[PDB]
């Protein structure tokens, strides 16, 4: 479905940014996507996610396997879904006002396979 949105929007599946969150099962890969502060190693490169937006802001940002990562990666996306703002390691804001954020998991898959029958969509 995410590749279907990318194909609808951009005439291509991989004209997008997929960042699979199973790679980020530790905490500190927050610094992989938002960058590193002044002083430290990868300062002059930027975060991957912020630069990948900063080229082509009208895009689709995909997060997959969201149950794999540590729970406190998701202060970054608190900023993101509050204002579309994100501040990389050099300290400039990156506008996410033209982005779509999709997060997938398999949380209640036992419960969904158990009770999708004989139940409404709502409850």
């Amino acid at each position: 479905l995410c590749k279907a949105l990318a194909n609808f929007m951009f005439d291509s599946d991989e004209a997008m940014v997929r960042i699979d969150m199973s790679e980020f099962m530790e905490k500190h890969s927050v610094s992989r996507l938002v960058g590193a502060p002044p002083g430290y190693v990868g300062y002059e490169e930027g975060g991957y996610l912020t630069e990948a937006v900063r080229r082509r802001p009208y895009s689709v940002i995909l997060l997959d396997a969201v149950e794999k990562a540590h729970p406190d990666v998701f202060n970054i996306l608190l900023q993101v879904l509050d204002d579309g703002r994100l501040t990389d390691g050099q300290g400039r804001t990156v506008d996410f006002r033209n982005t779509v954020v999709i997060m997938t998991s398999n949380l209640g898959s036992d419960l969904i396979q158990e009770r999708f029958g004989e139940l409404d969509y709502a409850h």
Partner: peptide, 24 residues
């Protein structure tokens, strides 16, 4: 009767930059 002109003689220097590292 020429006089040797004193020059301007533009120069050059450089500067490195360290990088610390966390150690997890």
């Amino acid at each position: 009767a020429a006089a040797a002109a004193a020059a301007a003689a533009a120069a050059a220097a450089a500067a490195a930059a360290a990088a610390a590292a966390a150690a997890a």
